[PDB]
Amino acid sequence: ATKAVCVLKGDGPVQGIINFEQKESNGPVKVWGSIKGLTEGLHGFHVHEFGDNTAGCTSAGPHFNPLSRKHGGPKDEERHVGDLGNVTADKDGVADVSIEDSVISLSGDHCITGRTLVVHEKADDLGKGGNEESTKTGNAGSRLACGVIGIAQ
Amino acid sequence: ATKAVCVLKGDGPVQGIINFEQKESNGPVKVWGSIKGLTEGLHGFHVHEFGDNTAGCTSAGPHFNPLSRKHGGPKDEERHVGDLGNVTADKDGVADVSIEDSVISLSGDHCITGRTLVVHEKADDLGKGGNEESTKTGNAGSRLACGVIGIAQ
Ligand SMILES: [Cu+2]
Ligand SMILES: [Cu+2]
Ligand SMILES: [Zn+2]
Ligand SMILES: [Zn+2]
């Protein structure tokens, strides 16, 4: 299997470790881990285009979107490659993440490795918000923590 | 023109930003930027295999070595792909890095994106130290700072 990992950090208390595993190059990627320090509720979760943390999360650029589609949720046909939807934090501020996605990959010319994973302030509306910002970012607010997705053993 | 970037951080004061540019695929990669907080003199500078910062720099693994060679300096045919030799810090503790290397790449099998750049405690002996450690790590000592190399624009 191909594996990757990401350590999420920011200016506040949000931090976490997210793991990625892809058994076959043309198969789905399992994404799992935990993020703490979040307000209870939904938080947008995206792969942004650049693995550039020189300005913290601010330098990561827009959602990763090599196919030039509009913003959506992970189960929508119309979505950015980087659209991983929402993670849910419990009353203790911990979001346990455990999903599978068939659009992102850990290899090939469009691979998320070397790009930035970001967890957001607010819920991602999955492009159903009914305004221009919705079909661009999902209105998920500020970038609370992020990290570069790296190759793992 | 392919570009990558890395923010170096550690447990101590060593920090900086290193840029990578490769005008042509399979062409040389220019590596440049500024690292501060170093002791004056030489410091080993390598790409390590894993972009895993879960345990700080320790989890980066060994030098990136897809061809299973012994450790050397960047000018040697016998070297790891990740062997970028030394960088030099001035009397103010600043290393104004400027390296050109044709063995690392920002694409293909020798791609370093998604892996970890590490700057070391001591000089890399470039495989000339006459012990087993020299042909593994260059005897460069501890990992002072590191970061995952990400895709840039
Ligand atoms: Cu995002
Ligand atoms: Cu090293
Ligand atoms: Zn999106
Ligand atoms: Zn080496």
PDB file of N, CA and C and ligand atoms in Angstrom, chain B residues 63 71 80 83 136, ligand 4:
ATOM      1  N   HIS B  63      18.057   8.773   4.959  1.00  0.00           N
ATOM      2  CA  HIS B  63      18.157   9.619   3.769  1.00  0.00           C
ATOM      3  C   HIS B  63      17.369   8.978   2.635  1.00  0.00           C
ATOM      4  N   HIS B  71      26.008   6.471   1.331  1.00  0.00           N
ATOM      5  CA  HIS B  71      26.011   7.918   1.524  1.00  0.00           C
ATOM      6  C   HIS B  71      27.271   8.558   0.905  1.00  0.00           C
ATOM      7  N   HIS B  80      23.319   8.922  -1.920  1.00  0.00           N
ATOM      8  CA  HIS B  80      21.862   8.863  -1.856  1.00  0.00           C
ATOM      9  C   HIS B  80      21.279  10.002  -2.677  1.00  0.00           C
ATOM     10  N   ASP B  83      21.272  13.298  -0.766  1.00  0.00           N
ATOM     11  CA  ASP B  83      22.523  13.846  -0.222  1.00  0.00           C
ATOM     12  C   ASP B  83      22.889  15.190  -0.833  1.00  0.00           C
ATOM     13  N   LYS B 136      26.516   5.886   5.902  1.00  0.00           N
ATOM     14  CA  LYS B 136      25.070   5.885   6.143  1.00  0.00           C
ATOM     15  C   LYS B 136      24.499   7.291   6.274  1.00  0.00           C
TER      16      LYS B 136
HETATM   17 ZN    ZN C   4      22.958  10.156   2.593  1.00  0.00          ZN
END
